[PDB]
Amino acid sequence: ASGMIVTDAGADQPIVFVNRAFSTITGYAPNEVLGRNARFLQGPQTDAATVARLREAIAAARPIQERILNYRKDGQPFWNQLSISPVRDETGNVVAFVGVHTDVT
Amino acid sequence: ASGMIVTDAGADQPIVFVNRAFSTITGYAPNEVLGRNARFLQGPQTDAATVARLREAIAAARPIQERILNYRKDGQPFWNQLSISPVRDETGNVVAFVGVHTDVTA
Numbered sequence: 001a002s003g004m005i006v007t008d009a010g011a012d013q014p015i016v017f018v019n020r021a022f023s024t025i026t027g028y029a030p031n032e033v034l035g036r037n038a039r040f041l042q043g044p045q046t047d048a049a050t051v052a053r054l055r056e057a058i059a060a061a062r063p064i065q066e067r068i069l070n071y072r073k074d075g076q077p078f079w080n081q082l083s084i085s086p087v088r089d090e091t092g093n094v095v096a097f098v099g100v101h102t103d104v105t
Numbered sequence: 106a107s108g109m110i111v112t113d114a115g116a117d118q119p120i121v122f123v124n125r126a127f128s129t130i131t132g133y134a135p136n137e138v139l140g141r142n143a144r145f146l147q148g149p150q151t152d153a154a155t156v157a158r159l160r161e162a163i164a165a166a167r168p169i170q171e172r173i174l175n176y177r178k179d180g181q182p183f184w185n186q187l188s189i190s191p192v193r194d195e196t197g198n199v200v201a202f203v204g205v206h207t208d209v210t211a
């Protein structure tokens with residue numbers, strides 16, 4: 001099953017919602033991630049260039065997909081196939097971001 | 106501000122998340138809507154042909170935009186500029202639906 005992360009659009013894109021599969025994949029319960037930026041999933045072997053592409057895409061509200069090394073709550077690394085898209089209203093304002101992720105280890 | 110509704114993909118699309126603007130626009134608190142299909146926003150002056158287009162688009166997981174007459178919790182009508190899109194994983198599976206809505210009553 002594919003995880004889903006919804007964040008606010010501004011400040012530092014705090015997580016406001018995760019689905020069941022997010023917890024299955026990452027080992028984190030919703031209560032311990034809500035209000036945090038999803039970058040806590042990253043760790044020592046995460047590719048910095050991949051992180052920088054995500055950072056630029058979110059800043060510009062551009063859709064992006066990456067395969068990124070993430071870490072479960074218990075510290076185990078896994079390959080996360082991640083897609084992020086902005087959610088926009090009719091006037092083009094960004095309301096939220098939505099991420100979908102799949103463990104492709 | 107623009108409301109956002111997230112629903113499950115399956116089983117008549119129950120609401121799983123709303124943002125604060127959803128409550129400002131509709132008068133419903135999250136507790137009052139979680140687990141329900143968003144059609145409780147409709148009422149007797151809602152255009153049946155618009156509802157049909159929504160029904161067919163959601164069943165097909167096709168993005169759709171419509172202006173639809175909706176009703177606040179206490180019954181006040183408002184025009185809802187609504188856009189609904191599926192959320193897909195890399196294999197194309199629909200994970201959720203996301204709706205963004207604005208009160209465009211003149």
Ligand SMILES: Cc1cc2nc3c(=O)[nH]c(=O)nc-3n(C[C@H](O)[C@H](O)[C@H](O)COP(=O)(O)O)c2cc1C
Binds near residue numbers: 006007038051082097
């Ligand atoms: C909706 C959404 C979902 C995200 N999901 C993930 C994720 O699953 N894994 C990850 O490493 N980063 C994820 N990110 C990216 C980080 O939150 C952050 O944007 C990224 O690391 C770049 O920013 P930084 O350089 O400030 O950390 C997500 C971001 C958004 C907006």
Ligand SMILES: Cc1cc2nc3c(=O)[nH]c(=O)nc-3n(C[C@H](O)[C@H](O)[C@H](O)COP(=O)(O)O)c2cc1C
Binds near residue numbers: 111156157185
């Ligand atoms: C994510 C999402 C958000 C929705 N938001 C609204 C809304 O704001 N107003 C509305 O009248 N219907 C909304 N709907 C549409 C109804 O939930 C429903 O799909 C539509 O009325 C057609 O179905 P029916 O004939 O089975 O009621 C939304 C649906 C989804 C999936």
